[PDB]
């Protein structure tokens, strides 16, 4: 049991080794409610967040917005619209490679 | 000016250093930098390791 446990974790970790590490995303995110028809059980579940990302050239910036689940973000500043990703305080996040099932 | 958890924020911090760990820049009394900055990057030892 212990060997299965350790080997699965080891293989899991190896598979993420070559994938992009998402450190450019630890920026403040300004989040508002989603402009759509949301059922009662989904109210407040999603947030529409914009942020300023780096790009291919380090002296250029881009405006990006995306939808996030509320569980992946945490408020900050003055408990208003300024939110950040949850992982930013604990550790950097790695994106899983899209080609790997 | 120290970096912080978020890339687009900075914090002002002060600390005490031993003189032997810093080197003046351009003979300017106000400006100093850490000794290792021109040479290899420094690494902090883990506080959990004796």
């Amino acid at each position: 049991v212990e060997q299965m446990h350790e080997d699965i974790i080891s293989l899991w970790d190896q598979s993420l080794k070559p994938c992009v590490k998402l450190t450019p995303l630890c920026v403040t995110l300004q989040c508002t409610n989603v402009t759509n028809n949301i059922t009662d059980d989904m109210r407040g579940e999603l947030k529409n967040c914009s942020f300023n990302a780096t790009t291919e050239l380090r002296n250029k910036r881009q405006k990006v917005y995306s939808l996030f689940y509320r569980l992946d973000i945490v408020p900050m500043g003055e408990n208003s619209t300024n939110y950040r990703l949850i992982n930013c305080n604990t550790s950097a996040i790695t994106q899983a490679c899209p080609k790997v099932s | 000016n120290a970096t912080t958890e978020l890339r687009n924020k900075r914090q002002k911090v002060y600390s005490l250093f031993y003189r032997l760990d810093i080197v003046p820049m351009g003979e300017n009394s106000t400006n100093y930098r850490l000794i290792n900055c021109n040479t290899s990057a420094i690494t902090q030892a883990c506080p959990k390791v004796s």
Epitope: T23, P24, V27, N52, T54, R58, N59, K60, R61 | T3, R7, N8, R10
Partner: antibody, heavy 130, light 106 residues
Framework: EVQLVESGGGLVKPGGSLRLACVGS????????MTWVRQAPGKGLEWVGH??????????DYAAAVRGRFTIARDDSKSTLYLQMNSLKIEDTGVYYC?????????????????????????WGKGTTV | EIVLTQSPGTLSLSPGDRATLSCRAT???????FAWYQQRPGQSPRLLIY???RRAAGIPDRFSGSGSGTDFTLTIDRLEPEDFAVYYC????????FGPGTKVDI
Amino acid sequence: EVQLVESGGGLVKPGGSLRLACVGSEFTFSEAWMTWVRQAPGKGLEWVGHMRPTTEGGAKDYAAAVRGRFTIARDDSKSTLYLQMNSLKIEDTGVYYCMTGVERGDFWSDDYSQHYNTYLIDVWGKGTTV
Amino acid sequence: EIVLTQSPGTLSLSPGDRATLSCRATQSVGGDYFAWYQQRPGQSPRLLIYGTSRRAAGIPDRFSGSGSGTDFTLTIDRLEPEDFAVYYCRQYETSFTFGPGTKVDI
């Protein structure tokens, strides 16, 4: 050279209509907050109305004096702001100015922190007289 | 529907003196929504100060100001001949209107 150029002003007898336009250049038009201000001879600066950046939703607002008579519109492919003034009155005579703001800045990121130092370029056109 | 007023009607100062220009609101305006412009007669107005205290790009350091709520001030450290213009205050939070303007004269 960031600039705005107004055109179309002239005097139309009361009850008629006139269309003004303003062409922006050297600025992403669609990202700009465009505002019409007018000044009749001997008068101060009167707000006419405005339209928020296209990219921020295109919301509009108007001075009470022109609500229901004036219409604000934009066509970003032409970098042009328009004002359609219907049911003109004598009190609508004056200089119509096209004014907006452009924030440009020098972005520079490292691998541990990023910064964006911005500067605001107040751009007004010369104004067109109605 | 907040209205701005200004004082004095005309400010009479010699060149080289210090201008003080007042603006008052009927209701509070957030600092990030208050601004001043300089209108040399015959010219389009030019933004001096925005966000209550922030200087516009291209504007000389002699221009400065401060304020909050319903009480704001624009000042000029030393008047130049070109500064004897009409200054207007403008709000842009809920109300996008201008005050009447103050002429600076000698």
